[PDB]
Amino acid sequence: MMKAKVIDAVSFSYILRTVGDFLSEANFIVTKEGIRVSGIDPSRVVFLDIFLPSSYFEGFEVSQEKEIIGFKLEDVNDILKRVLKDDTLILSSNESKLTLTFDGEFTRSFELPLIQVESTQPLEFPFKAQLLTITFADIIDELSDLGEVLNIHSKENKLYFEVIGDLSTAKVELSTDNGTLLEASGADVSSSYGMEYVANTTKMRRASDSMELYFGSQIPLKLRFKLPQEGYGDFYIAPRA
């Protein structure tokens, strides 16, 4: 049995919508540290790993050193869309059900029977950058409709996003020298990624102020969206063949 009041229900719902672009179902892994969600999408291109620390919540309570709560992303996300302006959201569980309760102008709970979800598991990067998440999201939202492939390269600690689609192209330079990068260092390295996967994560702007981008040649793109406290939403995206 556990219980947690979500301090930012909007951030919480955008995190779960992002997870749901990749996963049909998942386990909340609940410990006194907080709540973890990990998985690999069906195509096996993307591995994600979210950690919401106990401080992300209010009145976080646990009965168990580890509680595994299986759920369908779409069902949870459907319910989260039902949140009202002044609602507090409280997650709770027992042996049989996950409950989402909205406490506001009146009280409303939605229950979902637990489902059995097979648990899941799977390194350093030649290049590393830090940037605001809003900066990443603005740039990607713009490039994402131009083609199916995001090309990423670095040269002399500058980062370049390029897209060449069927009809149009773009090239964005990101660097400390201009408005857009916080820190960056490493080798001159080039790789390409499926744009739809990267475009999905721009929702993380509603939960995250800064992020880490890591990549190298023929290795994954890691996007760490840093959350309040010790929290993160990591997405690892396999390089194109």
Binding site: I79, R82, K97, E105, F106, T107, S109, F110, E111, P113
Partner: protein
Amino acid sequence: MVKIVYPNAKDFFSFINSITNVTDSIILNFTEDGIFSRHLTEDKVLMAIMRIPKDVLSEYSIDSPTSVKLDVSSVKKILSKASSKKATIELTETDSGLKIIIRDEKSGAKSTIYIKAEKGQVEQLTEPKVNLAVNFTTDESVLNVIAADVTLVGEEMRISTEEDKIKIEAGEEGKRYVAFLMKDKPLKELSIDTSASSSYSAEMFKDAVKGLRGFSAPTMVSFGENLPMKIDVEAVSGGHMIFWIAPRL
């Protein structure tokens, strides 16, 4: 010859549109007491009733009690003129149906529609004759929350009393919803004579709730143990829109 002047055109359109939640075609009945319309869905589970006492009309004149049938296309004509502006509506019979004049109150013109419509013979207004043990007052925003919630979770909803609250439940196999309504959270009023529960089509409840649109007044909901639910809203300019929903037994 039937001649009517409604002081609030906005409410007039709200009534017409509200009835449309139950039928595509509308029958208006002109009686000695005023105007009413009464329609049920094909399965008879949901009824819409518009009642307008003549004492809230600016002018009301009939020769004999008479009905006028507005087909789907006539309903569409009338609603195509729907507006929020302050206006008056003059409704008069013609040889082939009705004339409707809408008169803008603040400067100031008027526009007309001609409706081809079968006439005649008022059928009596019949409602459930039922004693309803539980009543509460709320508004359209709350009921719309409830309707969207129930409809997301199940085909059927159950409403009951539990101590001094109303409990609303819906669900399919494990997947359930439960809400509690009480006085001041969020209910404006709550009267529980005797404890009661009934179950209803969530879709029919949602349709009745759509029929509250445009009315600002508080909405009253009444139900009893395995009895029809009554939903009643009084228009600002006078007269009521009422929906009845048959229970699941």
